[PDB]
Design a protein around this ligand. Structure first.
Ligand SMILES: [K+]
Ligand SMILES: [K+]
Ligand SMILES: [K+]
Ligand SMILES: [K+]
Ligand SMILES: [K+]
Ligand SMILES: [K+]
Ligand SMILES: [Mg+2]
Ligand SMILES: [Mg+2]
Ligand SMILES: [Mg+2]
Ligand SMILES: [Mg+2]
Lengths: 142, 208, 62, 51, 238, 126
RNA sequence: GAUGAGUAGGAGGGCGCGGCGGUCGCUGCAAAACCUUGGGCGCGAGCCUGGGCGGAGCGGCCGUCGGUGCAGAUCUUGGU
RNA sequence: GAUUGUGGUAGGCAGCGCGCGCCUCCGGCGUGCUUCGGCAUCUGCGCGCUCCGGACGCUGGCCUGUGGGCUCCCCAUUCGA
RNA sequence: AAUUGUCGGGAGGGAAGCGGAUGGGGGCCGGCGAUGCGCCCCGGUCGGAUGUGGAACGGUGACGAGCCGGUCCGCCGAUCG
């Protein structure tokens, strides 16, 4: 966002290539966002990966329980190739959670989405474990 | 330590005495006198620090809603005045519907402990809900019956074969009950016979 | 039944937001909405109300 | 210059309870009702005892 | 560890100041609430004593008039309670306008009304559409307690606390439900303000029904002035 | 997946609003049409006649559009589209579009099983 | 917090059809169309989906355009 | 007796008990005002209770069954039309 | 699609169809309806400091200094997860 994120949001909230809309524009309308740097894939100014200078990106790496945690560099906004500071974590979930907290909240990067980042990390870790060892429980009991 | 209530309740939530009389009885004047014309100040109780809960293994994607506090606490189930120890009860439901049994005591859960006696009508020591029972005016002495060791836990399922210990306990309990029953003539037949409604019998008119 | 005009509902229409699609004007509207809410200033309220007005209702000044 | 932020304005409407039935609401609206009830009950008890 | 940014420090400091001022305001409010509770207790006691003394004085005056052999004319009622008994269909313009001015827009709505020549002449025009009388202390107390709703910013708020009354009528010294009841019953200096603050009462259909709403109460119907007999109707309607 | 919804689903009416006289004339379809005739008893709301829909029948907003299983529907056309529900598996369920082939449906089902995302029609084309 | 009638008529928000500029997708491991006491969503216009048939294309979304929505017209053509 | 639990970060508001004094404990003992009954006159803290800022708790049946559900279909019946 | 034949189900005292409520029968539905969670013991795998070096890099500051910081790799201890 070489221009202010508020302006970027004012422009892109109406339409963008990452916006997914379904079931019309009535009460049935469902909206989501596809950009990889949106923790909750939600079409909102808070989580938008296009209208924020500081953005958190959490996904699964190719192999070996490697989780990619990337942060958008505040000064390299005009350099897409080097816009993301990446870190591939292969250690335990505890260490991954500590690293995510340190890189998201302890430095006042984006404290408002610390919970979202932790939840996304937990979901990615669970997905990787299930992809490795197959489904073993239905997760239907409350 | 005061051994009697200072303010008896005329009704629920209203005391018999006013604030001035309560002051006089509680003796706040005495405490002020002894402390030097000023009430003693007591420091607030120190809260216990929360335990060092280990970090969670998972982080939910949604914030579960915590229910609001409910200030109402259930009270013990009330026992109808028509039901007293030794009262004869009529069962209106279940496999023993219509049977006449003897009431022994009310358990902690609120259910009623009853006995046939087992020999007279085949009804053992059992729990019956008060809502499915009719209390009659017939009373039998039960002072000689000891059921102290029997409580709500006696009937708890351990989860087909009845232990001999329960049979022995039933016999021991029923010996005194039958001995007391024998005093009243025809009470044996009354307890051995079930209750039924015949032609032109109106429950709303029967007194019981 | 209740003896009310139109069920007690209003029948007057006033602007509650700009009809324009100018993003800069929208940002100004957000700014002055916040100012009006958190300051209760009559000047800010007047500015916010005038930000909604149409072109002919915002005449130029020589 | 902003005024202090407010977080306790969106309180749920308190359910209306008839003071004529439950005592606590009656006392909250009018504390003297407690004294009135106490005096009335005591006077009735005294009259019954005398009779 | 990580140095705290100046923006965070400033926000925390201002939050601390706001919390401190809020705590001070809460303490002051608690103290004032204690004093207000004491005051309203004393005022309610005084009002109850006043009502009892008034009843005793009326009885004594009647008895002494009989003893002297003359007649005692009771003071004319200063307060009326009016209940609409007809629907909104096929209304004449004058009747509809008068009912709006009396704030009776729905069948079985009730309102208090101070007795005046102007108000009485207004009510005389709509007599067939309403029934009214002289409310009791019990009637007024029960109406305000069970169905009393106050008007705050043109909104209808239930009188679940004395603060609702204080917010609107505090300037006039009315800060409690008992104060409101006393003002209404005695038609005090601020009766107009208190009555306007009171939202029109939405009464249920009569528990025992009506006799005939198409006839005056004098002929055996329901319309018109039924004086002291409005109280039993209020019992059945509340 | 444990649905987040807790309030019971209440339907004010479960019957369809059928067009008047669609039973009588074949050419008149069932899809609702409001009568505009001057004398129409249905338009006038004569009792014992066909009922007309109105906003009063509106579903409670908390339970609106919720399927009986307690989740909300989202149509997915590929496994890439499936991942959008990774952080909403307790509120949203995925339904595979009718035109997806069996080969892609298998991959979508496997990915949804990995992601703990409910599929409403996971047995189709099997 | 209050409130809910509507012909003629006005307006708002939405549903549906066919193109164009973009964007995101589906399809011989079976598209469109059609069929179905399969199922579900929406107050509703409608929409999503199971199964069948069919055997080559089609859809969602943002703008924008139009020869764009039928029960009537002794309506037109064809069929019964 | 009947209908019903809308909300979900609050121990709030109101009223009241036990300890902070003693005795001989269905109660009694201090200062003021009383209509001689009584009184929000002294009424402060800590811990608690309640008709107190919208329902909680226990038990049972059943879970591949001749079970449960249904907005689907064909019918019958009462009312309407 | 109108319309028609056949088989199967059903109904029928001078229309049929239709709105509302149940019921009989049929049809359909397994996200139709769960079996997990916490604390311990045994066994199997994978990693384990605030120490010491290397690779690339970030927050802030001023896309300087300074301060702070995470990821990965190599070792001495630690013997935990
Ligand atoms: K048709
Ligand atoms: K309408
Ligand atoms: K397209
Ligand atoms: K279909
Ligand atoms: K278009
Ligand atoms: K109840
Ligand atoms: Mg009303
Ligand atoms: Mg007339
Ligand atoms: Mg064309
Ligand atoms: Mg055909």
């Amino acid at each position: 966002t070489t221009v202010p994120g508020q302006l970027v949001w004012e422009i892109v909230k109406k339409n963008n290539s990452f916006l997914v809309k379904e079931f019309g524009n009535g009460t049935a309308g469902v909206v989501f966002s596809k950009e990889p740097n949106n923790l909750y894939n939600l079409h909102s100014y808070k989580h938008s990966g296009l209208a924020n200078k500081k953005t958190v990106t959490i996904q699964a790496e190719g192999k070996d329980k490697s989780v990619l945690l990337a942060t958008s560099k505040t000064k390299k906004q005009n350099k897409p190739s080097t816009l993301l500071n990446k870190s591939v974590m292969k250690k335990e979930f505890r260490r991954m959670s500590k690293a995510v907290t340190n890189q998201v909240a302890d430095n006042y990067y984006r404290p408002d989405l610390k919970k979202a980042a932790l939840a996304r990390l937990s979901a990615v870790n669970r997905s990787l474990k299930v992809a490795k060892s197959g489904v073993k429980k239905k997760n239907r009991q409350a | 330590a005061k051994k009697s209530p200072r303010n008896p309740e005329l009704i629920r939530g209203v005391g018999k005495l006013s604030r001035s009389k309560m002051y006089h009885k509680k003796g706040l004047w005495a405490i002020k006198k002894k402390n030097g014309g000023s009430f003693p100040v007591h420091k607030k109780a120190a809260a216990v620090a929360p335990p060092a809960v280990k970090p969670p293994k998972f982080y939910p994607a949604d914030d579960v809603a915590k229910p609001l506090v409910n200030k109402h606490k259930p009270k013990p189930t009330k026992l109808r005045a028509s039901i007293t120890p030794g009262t004869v009860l009529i069962i209106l439901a279940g496999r023993f519907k219509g049977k006449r049994v003897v009431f022994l005591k009310q358990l902690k859960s609120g259910l009623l402990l009853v006995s046939g006696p087992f020999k007279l009508n085949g009804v053992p020591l059992r729990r019956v809900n008060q809502a499915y029972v009719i209390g009659t005016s017939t009373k039998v002495d039960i002072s000689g019956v000891n059921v102290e060791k029997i409580d709500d836990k006696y009937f708890a399922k351990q989860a087909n074969v009845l232990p001999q210990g329960k049979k022995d306990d039933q016999k021991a309990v029923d010996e005194a009950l039958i001995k007391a029953v024998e005093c009243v003539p025809e009470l044996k037949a009354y307890l051995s016979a079930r209750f039924s409604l015949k032609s032109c019998m109106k429950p709303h008119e029967l007194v019981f | 039944g209740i003896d009310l005009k139109a069920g007690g509902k209003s029948k007057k229409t006033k602007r509650t937001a700009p009809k324009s699609d100018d993003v800069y004007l929208k940002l100004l509207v957000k700014l002055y909405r916040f100012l009006v809410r958190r300051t209760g200033s009559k000047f800010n309220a007047v500015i916010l109300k005038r930000l909604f007005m149409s072109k002919i209702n915002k005449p130029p000044l020589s | 210059v902003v005024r202090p932020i407010k977080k306790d304005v969106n309180k749920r409407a308190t359910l209306k309870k008839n003071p004529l039935k439950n005592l606590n609401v009656l006392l909250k609206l009018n504390p003297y009702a407690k004294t009135a009830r106490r005096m009335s009950l005591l006077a009735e008890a005294q009259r019954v005892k005398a009779k | 560890g990580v140095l705290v940014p100046e923006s965070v420090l400033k926000k925390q400091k201002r939050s601390e100041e706001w919390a401190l001022v809020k705590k001070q305001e809460l303490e002051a409010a608690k103290k004032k609430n204690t004093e207000n509770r004491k005051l309203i207790y004393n005022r309610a006691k005084q009002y109850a004593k006043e009502y009892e003394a008034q009843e005793r004085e009326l009885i004594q005056l009647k008895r002494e008039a009989r003893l002297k052999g003359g007649f005692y004319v009771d003071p004319e009622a200063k307060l009326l309670f009016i209940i609409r008994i007809r629907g909104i269909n096929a209304m004449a313009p004058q009747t509809k306008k008068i009912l709006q001015l009396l704030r009776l827009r729905q069948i079985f709505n009730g309102v208090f009304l101070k007795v005046n020549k102007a108000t009485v002449n207004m009510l005389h025009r709509v007599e067939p559409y309403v029934t009214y009388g002289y409310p009791n202390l019990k009637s007024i107390r029960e109406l305000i307690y069970k169905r009393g709703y106050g008007k705050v910013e043109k909104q209808r708020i239930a009188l679940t606390d004395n603060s609702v009354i204080e917010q609107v009528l505090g300037k006039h010294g009315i800060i409690c439900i008992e104060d409101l009841v006393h003002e209404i019953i005695t038609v005090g200096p601020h009766f107009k303000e208190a009555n306007n603050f009171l939202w029109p009462f939405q009464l249920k259909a009569p528990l025992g029904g009506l006799k005939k709403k198409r006839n005056h109460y004098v002929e055996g119907g329901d319309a018109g002035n039924r004086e002291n007999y409005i109280n039993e109707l209020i019992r059945r309607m509340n | 997946a444990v649905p987040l919804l807790t309030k019971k689903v209440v339907k004010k009416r479960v019957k369809r609003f059928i067009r008047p006289q669609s039973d009588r004339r074949i050419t008149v379809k069932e899809s609702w049409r409001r009568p505009k005739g001057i004398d129409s008893r249905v338009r006038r709301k004569f009792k014992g006649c066909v009922l007309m829909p109105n906003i009063g029948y509106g579903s409670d907003k908390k339970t609106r559009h919720y399927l009986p299983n307690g989740f909300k529907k989202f149509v997915v056309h590929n496994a890439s589209e499936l991942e959008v529900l990774m952080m909403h598996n307790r509120t949203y369920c995925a339904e595979i579009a009718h035109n997806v082939s069996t080969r892609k449906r298998k991959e979508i089902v496997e990915r949804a099983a990995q992601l703990d995302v409910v599929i409403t029609n996971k047995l189709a084309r099997l």
